[PDB]
Symmetry: none
Subunit: 196 residues, 6 copies
């Protein structure tokens, strides 16, 4: 199977996505980081362009909140499996989440999938095919799905479904991290860094 | 909805644009600026050269009048949502407006969209697709498109678009801010710096 | 309107080009220059390569006859308007002409459109589409049209349209300039500077 | 015939991949190394992003355990054959493996296909298209196939096929190496280095 | 009209090409060199890659046979006019002629048009649509047409059409230059570094 | 036609490609070398990275064997031909062979073609499309086709192709070589260099 459904893992997130117009999918990302040999973002396959765009875009948010500049480190991003036929999210919050995880060595809840794009301001703004994703998620045996707050009323769950996934609307990057990073002294420090 | 339409709000604005044909869409920008360890405009997409340009024109206006150097501070320009076959506007005023809005950190009326092209020396130059653009601001339920002046007569709106919206003829950048940049002490300050 | 058709403005020049396969359009153009403190030609959209070829060529000529070394300047060039399926003359001379005008800061006559491919050496080479361009010129109500002298047998106008525009042709850029540049001290002192 | 099914060769591994939207193919590779007197990774084709990626995850892994650095080496990789319609897997292990084989000088077992994505930490990640990666390797007469353990449930074989190949599930790049590298003094001391 | 049919001009050659595959056309070019003040080939719009290629090949023999390194110069090629539906020769001897011409300032004779491709060892190789081309040469009042020696029997002319143009087959670059460069002291010294 | 087929010229190697689907193209290569006046591999088009690969590999095996180093040469590598959908073998041996030719200044049997991938041990790896290649090599009325050895059995031929040609299998560069160099003193000196 292409993704983990529970446990905690560094630089590892289950985003969600769309195949064709039919349907949604579990889209899992690893991020890993190593210092550069000036610094680039490595990824390949049908999604590399989504990946440099999120990673690059989010990169100031990522400097306000470790203090590691991205151009001092190499960011190794893959998508786990292959997917031709898939639209992914712009500035996707999973790809930023997995990177912050990897930079910070703080693990991620696999049982919580996510969707949204990430304002360079740090907000999370709406994305297509939410119902179709939750749906893929309900199909995956994942437990909670984070989503943007303005897709709140695009969640057209057809009952019996209303109780098999916990749908969590967020609107900051800090809410996404709060809700998926493993508890501990590290995330506690981390969270406290989210302000002005 | 997806794109915001009520409120005021920082380094983010309503670009008008056109997917080629008769074909309007509302294209927001979102800007953000961070004083740097010079600096680099960071933006992605088919419309980076434009993000870059808008920004480059807009530092003359700001080192000159304000006397802020925008070379000291990395700048994020990002357009929103999935846009395909879009023609952008050279030195597009949505961006430069958002850029003044990041940097003097002062919100913008989101009733208001706009389109235009910013000359280094401050002008709002005319642009193609001025009508279909207004038609876009309309089925997106907005209050006021701002629009270049030399574009008035490229409005030729029909009965189902006539009186639906406030069109603002602008010649200068500061006519743009006069009209969208929210109110109080900072705007007032930014204004006088100019003349 | 996307162009001006009377008076003088700095750094502004109504080009001529062809849309699809019949017709002309006026290709209006602005250039502006600030010191760089070397520098670039910033232009965007579809016709950018032409802007850089023309500024690349104007500037050598600038350096030979005046003093001003475009080396030291950012030239910012725009096609007021947005031009798809439109196709220029290489080393377009509207463009070179708008640059020579931002730099000298002598305004240009808007009542006269033009078209020419500019050699590094200073000639105005011939260009495709004269007849049609001159028709578009007639159409926006522009008084004259400056063309490459070798394009003179290409002019195919119905006798009544020969009443409508002046057709001037030319073999060197400095002739485009007496022909366009605002009458003046500056302009004179400038014509002096291309004594050959 | 485009790959080998018997014997050991230095720096040659039988990858596995898909052509169109089913059918596996065996995807064989040489890597080779020479020093760089910096270092570059040399591969053409539709699959070379992958080749560059594979190698760049191997380096750090090798450095961390073996001490050898690859900045001071040029690496030359080839997909023996011509590979259109084909997607490889991210950072294929088969390439990672063929690089380790090169540098260390230890023959690889040609009768064992392998598929997988190597992570920078040395972990073996799951992949698209396992079954036809398996069918195709049977098709070629390979005796074992190494697959990412996390894909054990994707293995879908008819019994007449269950007996025809050995499915070996791994989760780490050192396991792959033990399972493929030729036996001997080199192999062992090499392993003592990943523990 | 777009080419000069007689006299000599620095860096100015009448190549031949084909419009679609109905007909030949004169495709006239100009190369011009300025110093680099790392060096480059500037050129525009439609046959810009034929242009970059031709030069990138001949560089070779620009050094090997004679004088200057073109990585220290900028090569500014233009096609005089505009070029859609036209098909460009590779490693074009008309470019190389133009570029050798501009560097030596030895004028090229405009009553002789040319087609063919330059190998890097400097044989001229067959090209396509030669009859059509010559038919363009003929049509356009150029006196003489240089063509590749392996196309000799691909020339299929009507009676009337054969005396209408001198046809000159060549097998090597130095013959093309023997043929089109202004006699005089400078060509003599150029031509005599085209040994062994 | 545009290519060689009996004969013995230097720097030139009739290789083999597929135009995409499976349609035999002879793809002639011209190599050329001069000294840097460090050095460079000077190629044009889609194949231009193959070239530098074929080159790269060949310098390695030359430095080793002959002792000669050719980091000093400026290498020119040319594709004779005009087709798109062009599809080349990695480290393609044609190029490897035109080059070794170039350098050792040694004429090639024009009457022979080849496909092949060359490794840094100067093995001949097999390549796909073996049968289409043997065909354009027939259509091109050539006498011999060198193929990689392990390609030995992707060889078919309906009645119409069988015994139309000396197909010749190889596993090493020095075979490729023994096959195609013009006999005598410099073949010889350079040959045994691969043995010493």
């Amino acid at each position: 199977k292409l993704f983990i459904t529970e446990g905690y893992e560094v630089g590892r997130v289950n985003g969600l996505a769309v195949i064709g117009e039919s349907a949604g999918i579990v889209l899992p990302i690893i991020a890993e980081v190593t210092p550069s040999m000036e610094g680039r973002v490595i990824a390949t396959g049908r999604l590399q362009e989504i990946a440099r765009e999120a990673v690059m875009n989010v990169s100031a948010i990522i400097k306000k909140y470790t203090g590691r500049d991205i151009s001092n480190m190499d960011v190794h991003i893959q998508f786990v499996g292959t997917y031709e036929g898939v639209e992914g999210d712009s500035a996707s919050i999973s790809i930023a989440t997995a990177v912050i995880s990897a930079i910070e060595g703080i693990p991620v809840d696999q049982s919580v999938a996510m969707t949204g794009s990430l304002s360079v301001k740090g907000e999370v703004l709406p994305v297509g095919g939410v119902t179709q994703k939750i749906e893929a998620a309900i199909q995956a045996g994942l437990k909670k799905v984070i989503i943007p707050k303005d897709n709140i009323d695009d969640v057209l769950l057809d009952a019996e479904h209303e109780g098999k996934i916990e749908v969590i609307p967020v609107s900051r990057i800090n809410e996404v991290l709060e809700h998926v990073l493993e508890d501990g002294k590290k995330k506690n420090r981390l969270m406290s860094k989210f302000k002005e």
